[model samples]
Target chain A: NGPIIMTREERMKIVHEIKERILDKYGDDVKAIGVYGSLGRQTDGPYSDIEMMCVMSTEEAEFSHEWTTGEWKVEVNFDSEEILLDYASQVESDWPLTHGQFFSILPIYDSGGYLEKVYQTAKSVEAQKFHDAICALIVEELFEYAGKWRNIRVQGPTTFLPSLTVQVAMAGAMLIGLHHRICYTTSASVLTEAVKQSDLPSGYDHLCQFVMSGQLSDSEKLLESLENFWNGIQEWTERHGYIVDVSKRIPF
Target chain B: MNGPIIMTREERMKIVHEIKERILDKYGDDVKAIGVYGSLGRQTDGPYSDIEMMCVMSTEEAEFSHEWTTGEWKVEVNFDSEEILLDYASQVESDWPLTHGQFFSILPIYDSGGYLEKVYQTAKSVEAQKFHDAICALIVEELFEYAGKWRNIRVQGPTTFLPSLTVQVAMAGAMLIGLHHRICYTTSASVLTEAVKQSDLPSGYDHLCQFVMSGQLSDSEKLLESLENFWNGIQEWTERHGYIVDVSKRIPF
Candidate 1:
């Protein structure tokens, strides 16, 4: 499915108008409503979402089932302060650290110091033995899964490509979830608990909601999304001095 | 390791009189001598000699010293005829199907019929499997070991790169010997026989063996002959539709 495009500046102006409307309608109860994404990161093209992640005195980010109108996408979400900070801590936790690794790497608009504190407060411990082992195991499996895609690209139907599709879903969201849990608890049991407690940027629905946002559960479009995330991750890894692209070069 | 060439029609004609004279002088008899990569397959090569595989017979193949005369770089290798053909079978085998499945689809070489047939035959016969477990395992280990040279070709020595060196030797003569047996046996036993052989090509030796004669080995010449024996064999295989070189496109042909 597709939607029409609207300029980022035009959309944010509406975001403020929405904030005003919500404030006016609910008065002081509106808490905070701010846009996120390219507009918030201040890197938007002409057309960007009036995308936003909101906060309330209460906790949790979410939305209603009813539909609304906008030449833009209006995703409503809410969060408590601790969970917001926890999100940042999650990304900071990745061994080869990544923002998405933590729940807090959520982009923000001019919510001012709040988002900064979230980033500043973020912290992930060193890569413990257990963390390294599990991460390696999972990455190895993903490597094989990626190999299946390579095989399919080379071969045809006789070579069934189950793992290629699996890789997208797995690498995209599942990994993000795994990384999210690893930092805080450092114990699977505890990490699982932490994951249960994490919040989503406004529109994200699944654990990898951030990762899965652009596409659905099983569309080939997810392949493109996976690749983008994959490439983006490489740059992050390069900065960390862990160049892993070497794994791919070999004589067949 | 200095030695002479094994297979020269010119040398053969020249030496034919001397060889006959020797037989008559030694015993009241008539005899002949010819060289092949196969018969002298066991001869080891030396520095200053190019690696070659040729077979000489009459003064039969195996009896001749492993040497090729000057101007002749290498002779046919015949030491391990059994395993080599199977190795070839495996390469041409895995090269296509696996290439398509793991890499890309390939068109077979025009003369691939015999190679492909052996591949299929070996896959079925027990010998067919010998390559996978025996040969493939060694290859896998070599690849792992050479993981470094995969990027850096130079080695610590004058370049004793174990894998690359081994591969070149293996491809050159060992395969011919192996294929020689495959051609001879044409059955399951051919597979296992290919396994027992190892490489013996050398880099240096004497010269002028082209005109003279000596042990078939890897010397400054075909001091260590290997074989052109397989050339005829695989050629026959291709004619018999014994192997497949490329993907089959024509339904009947």
Candidate 2:
């Protein structure tokens, strides 16, 4: 493939060649190799990149980069087995999005069957860890939104600044759904899946409209919807014998 | 001067003429475009109102403004190079107070290179794919902070005009989102009120936008009273939500 790299098949061929060369050179040192994101999902456009993750059993330090060609952008991430295992352990607690991505990875090369083990581990997430992660997201992330509100107040709204608060709040709600092991797609679109698949609160639609659809503006109404969703997050977690501490609530 | 100049309409026009002449005499060659706005540009300027002017040139870094009195009334001149001015033209990402003030408010006084025409087109072009919802969220969040943070402290008031100016800057943000779709401009009272009326912003935005734009109703002595309505809304939203942002009071608890 040269210049623009036009077709997906041509792009895949080039990626396979690179993967083959990598396997030939390193051989046993590389424990596992796979691809994710748009390329793994087979939804890549001509401009889209081929993302590959290579797990090493040797002394190679973790690294990631896009090997920029004149024609194609091939993204690759390299890690050790220890790093992958540690990251897999974080799936239920603090790495829900990572869990989803790792869940859908397309295997390119496998030796120790690490990818299968990560998928199984993700499926068996603990209810308590799920609740802890959701609570942390709500507290840590809502405070971040309060900070964004302060920034927007002082500097005024910007391209991304206005959506910052809504996005974070909705994301916390999405993570709450994830605690119950609800399957989802993209990070941003997780709200869509949660609303579609889970027993969220009554204000889920209103919260979705504000953050997902960008429909409402009344801070009064928004706060009401947020607290409403907060109550649902509490109830959902409680159903599984976990209670989120409400003391971490966002102050006015 | 004499506790505010009281004179015939012709006397007022003469002072305006001389002020324009002085500015052109000093910075005329370097300036590419210029205009006046507000009550002065509209010819409804009175003894109390400030005469406002804007300048657009080619090669200036950022933008700047100044205010001074020259016998009849105070002159508040806002100026920027086209380079600096265009940076604020980005519909979504701009800080936009000066960008908007220059684009929407200024009445063209002179033009050598058609910068004003281009800005007008930019303001009028209607494919704002991302304006509506983001702005609504942004405005609401801003009010949240106004209630929790600034209003908690009693330092800012009408005399300092910090809260007053803060209200205007936020309005400019809303106006920027509106202008992305509508053909209009300005942070002044009359202009903003007209803008709010024509705007299709969500219902949540209407009350606040109306309140801030109405700041124009206050001329000088009454301006503080005008801003009181806005500050009260902030407090109202704060208490109604039972929001607690007092970091000092949180220590013991």
Candidate 2 lDDT by residue in tens digits, A1-252: 212424668767766776786688778888888877656777544444456788887764587644334334455677887786666656443364456667668887888797777667666666666666665554444433433333333343332332343454456655656556654544434555556655555566566655443333454455456556545655555565544343311111
How many clashes show up per model? 99, 2
- State the DockQ, from 0 to 1, for candidate 2: 0.01
Candidate 1 residue lDDT tens string, B1-253: 1112233344433333343343335423212221221111113212211222211122312232222222222222222222443443345322222211111111112111243344336533445444333333322222212222212222122121222222222232233334323322111112222323322212111121111111111121121122112222323443353332222221111
- What TM-score against the true fold does each predicted structure earn? 0.28, 0.43
Instruction: Give the C-alpha miss distance for residue B132 in model 1, angstroms.
Output: 54
Chain A: TM-score in each candidate? 0.46, 0.74
Worst 10 residues of 2 chain A by lDDT: A243-252
lDDT of candidate 2 vs native?
0.51
Candidate 1 regions with alpha-carbon error over 4 angstroms: A25-31, A59-70, A91-113, A123-252, B1-253
